[model samples]
Target chain A: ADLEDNMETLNDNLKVIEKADNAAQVKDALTKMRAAALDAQKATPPKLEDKSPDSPEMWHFRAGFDHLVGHIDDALKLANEGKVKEAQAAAEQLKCHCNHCHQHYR
Target chain B: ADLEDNMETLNDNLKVIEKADNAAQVKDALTKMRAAALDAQKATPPKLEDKSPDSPEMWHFRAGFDHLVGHIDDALKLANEGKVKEAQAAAEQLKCHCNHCHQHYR
Candidate 1:
């Protein structure tokens, strides 16, 4: 299930880049990546009870892991659309999110 | 410098939540976080020469780290403004970016 979801996200991002535009391409790419990201999120199975943060299957930990990838997907989409500056900016934001999540949840 | 930049990013996110609007509050918060993220990014001293990916001082590594934090800030701001659904969605998106970056860079 995880692999399938990851593949779907990868495929969707690929499509968005293949159809780039001037003004909206980057935005559309972001949108597509965001959508795929949300879909992949559904694959996460909720924990029936609280689990240790170190547990590999803990729900919140899974969610945190999911979030880290999502940010990078958005950054890559922006990069592919030739939105280098925006992509660069998004890249910074993505890192911040990942570190914060790891600090608290991982 | 890094600590000061992180504080600035945190301060900006705090301000966005203190003045949330119904229509565009979440959007504005995301924008603010994105801006602070970009600012923190400027503090990264780019390497004038090639550096190993494992090098903490590598520009790419710093950029990757910055991106992770930026995404979380945006997600947190969205959550603070009661945009739980949007924030949840953003959280997923944020993760993908983080994972992708780590897969390649980290």
Candidate 2:
């Protein structure tokens, strides 16, 4: 539920970011983006590992969330500095983390 | 901030509700919608007017929230009974309150 909830929020924040026309809108979108990513990174996938090489690394989900973090930071960095187009471009990468994790875990 | 935040969430819930394929999805969407409406109703617009002929009744915002509540409850009632399509149709009326209030105040 958290994954669905948080990801849906991130998607909406992207809607705001991608079409924002001014600094005020950009900042609002960035603020929403950061909050959504913060909530999203808290989402955890289930895993039971016993250090077996055959078993998938339990860290992949965490790594995926870190990728989400990277997406947030990059877009936010660009957005905070008024690079609107680049910021929106950076924000587009946010979906990759969720997709990559869902491929393996969902 | 709360109105913008909650309404954006409600909008996303509308997305889920409109396209939901099953009772599970309908319930989840309704849950989100209910929560969003609850938070939105708490969003009080600033006003300090005593009995005056010119004062827009502070009650208008409260009434707008009530309309949102009606939208949520009707949809939830239908969804709880497994009436997914009907529930979503009922949910479509959810935006009237926001638009009505914003047109007057925003």
Candidate 3:
């Protein structure tokens, strides 16, 4: 339930990021994206329920989420600094996060 | 600045978790610990500043923080479920996280 909600938030904001034309729009999406990633990091994905929290598989999953969060934070920093083109470029890489994780867990 | 502040928050809450006498105390500490761990996860430690976020070293560092966050979240769940003994036992293992990370970066 929690993971799904968090992921939905991430997906929605990712769409916002894709369509964003300015730093302000990117900033709003990234802020929500960061929170969603953090929340999702604490969750055990359905397929991983049989594993321990510290298992290599779980660590990989968590680290992937954190990687995405780091990207979101970096993009947010860029946006806040009025570097719209740079921020959008950074946000574009976020698509890799979705594909990477979904391939393993989704 | 951000990483240090987050680490300090985590360290203080860890001490609280260590001395917690009941579930409520444990819950409070773990909640704070979780947030700190997440915050710290986004930072590049002083030793890792030269590395890319996706570099092996940075991934190891991020994974370590995520591992700590996982432990905090687990302990929080146990505490909230009223399993005081089990919760304390789980929280005790968190001390390993400090030593493990400090050994590499601090």
Candidate 4:
């Protein structure tokens, strides 16, 4: 349930990033996006039901979360530095991570 | 986008209440629930598209958000007082508010 909640939070924050103009707004959204992605890192996707915690599939799954979180972290840093446009550009790539992970894990 | 996000937050908190044991956990979820409901109150539901802001349908829609927020407020108070069971009971009624509102303005 929390995994789905976190995913929704991530997606909603992305929408916020799409139109946000101020550094504060972008930072806020990126902060939430980073938090949600980090939380999602600990959860196992049902699609990987047969994979052990240390299995290659499980590592790949967790790496997907890391990839997304790293993108958000970079966006957040840029937003913190008052580079709102750069932050938004970085956030635009978030969909790629979402689709990439969902294709294999979700 | 925020409306859907807030609704998901409310739903997720309800799921948390379904399993939460301690007062802190219940209080946390209730706090989030209240915030989401309050945020939702300011948004107009698409179902009331043709209705004027002062119209009965708009009032009804806003009232639904108020009703849900009130429930969350009550539950939060109970949780704050260490009445976890009672708080859970109060939170359970949130579903009725969700269904009642969605019936007219999903």
Candidate 5:
């Protein structure tokens, strides 16, 4: 449920960023998206197995989640200066990564 | 990433509990699981659109996460007494709650 809720907020942030018509708009939207992505990665007790604390799968899953956080942060930096195009490009790239990972891992 | 990390740990704890062979095993697994569940719900700044900080959707997400933490606590207590079946039953119910929440919300 939290994951799905996060997806909704992510969508909202996407809409906000694309519809920006001014610096204020971009700023507002950028903040929203950053916050959404940040919240989306809330911690949980994923004790899948003993599989050793250093299992490849463990890190891979962590990598996928961190991937989203990283891109969002990158886009935020761009949008801060009203760089809508750059931010949009990053957002789309973020979407591709998010969907690809979820498609296989979800 | 943190959420997925938590999920993996939760899964790890699950397998440990299920395959437990003795009190020592369950005790270790239970402690690990309780720690994982507690870690799963670490506070984050979920500031999604002023939304009054009391939005129903916001709490719903929180509830789902807290739900896992709660059941894990229950299972841990039962396992403390060497009650294997009870803990496993609790885990299955937790799974049902998790899947249903994800099915509707994911």
Candidate 6:
């Protein structure tokens, strides 16, 4: 349920960021979204039981999680600088982390 | 005018691809956009007159262009597999190419 909610919110926030025509609006949306994603990551613990580095799930989860955090970092930087278009672009890159996870795990 | 139109089309195609709920739609959109972007690249002759490997503009342009192509390749693979969610995530990574270019070049 928590994952579902976070996914929905992330999607919503992305829409808002994408629609933003100005840097300030983009920055504001990205800041909120990054915080939300980080919170989600914290709340969702990994199920590493019975998993090895060679396990597909394990590999996917680790790569996806790392990439997601990296996305948040990039987003935060763009937001701080008030670069909306660039922030939106970073947000897009962040989405790939999620996709990579789903492809392997879901 | 051509560059502007192509940029708009690229942005629009990205939006369509993002909203795609299935692999087929995402693949279709990516194919069109990638082709369009390639066309734009061909149309806009590189202004290499005053630029060299050491020039910031040249370095940024080359790096950004290469990264963009790489993103398209990733996107195509994800889309081909019908991984809509993963495709979206890859799209996010692709956005970083744009951000990096802007930070360095304009």
Best by DockQ: 6
- Give the fraction of reference interface contacts each candidate recovers: 0.00, 0.00, 0.00, 0.00, 0.00, 0.00
The reply for model 5, stretches above 4 Å from the true place, is A1-106, B43-53
Off by more than 4 A, model 4: B1-106
Which is the better candidate, 5 or 6, if ranked by DockQ? 6
lDDT against true structure, model 3? 0.79
lDDT of 3 by residue, A37-61 (tens): 8989999999999999767567667
lDDT per residue for candidate 4 within B6-83, as digits (tens), equals 889988989998799887799999898888888888887788767788997787678778757766887788789887
DockQ for candidate 2, C-alpha atoms: 0.01
Q: Please, what is the TM-score per model?
A: 0.34, 0.43, 0.49, 0.49, 0.41, 0.49
Model 1 Cα lDDT, one tens digit per residue, B15-106: 55455545256565566556655655555343323555434345454565465566667676767777766575665565455465445443
Where's the lowest-lDDT run of ten residues in candidate 1 chain B?
B40-49
lDDT of 1 at B93: 61
Q: What is the interface RMSD of each candidate, in Å?
A: 7.4, 16.9, 12.1, 17.1, 13.4, 6.7
TM-score of candidate 6 versus the correct structure, residues matched by position: 0.49
Candidate that beats the other on lDDT, 2 or 5, i.e. the better one: 2
Model 4 score (lDDT): 0.78
Q: In candidate 5, residue A90 scores what lDDT?
A: 50
Tens digits of per-residue lDDT, candidate 3, B1-106, equal 3999998987788778768788888898888888888888888889988878799778878878876887788778889987665676667556645765786687
Please report the TM-score between candidate 3 and the true structure: 0.49
Regions of candidate 3 where Cα sits further than 4 Å from its true position: B1-106
Please estimate how well model 1 matches the true structure, expressed as its whole-model Cα lDDT. 0.54
* Chain A TM-score from candidate 4: 0.93
Itemize residue pairs with steric clashes in candidate 4: none
- CAPRI quality band, candidate 1: incorrect
Which residue segments of model 2 deviate by more than 4 Å?
A1-106, B46-55
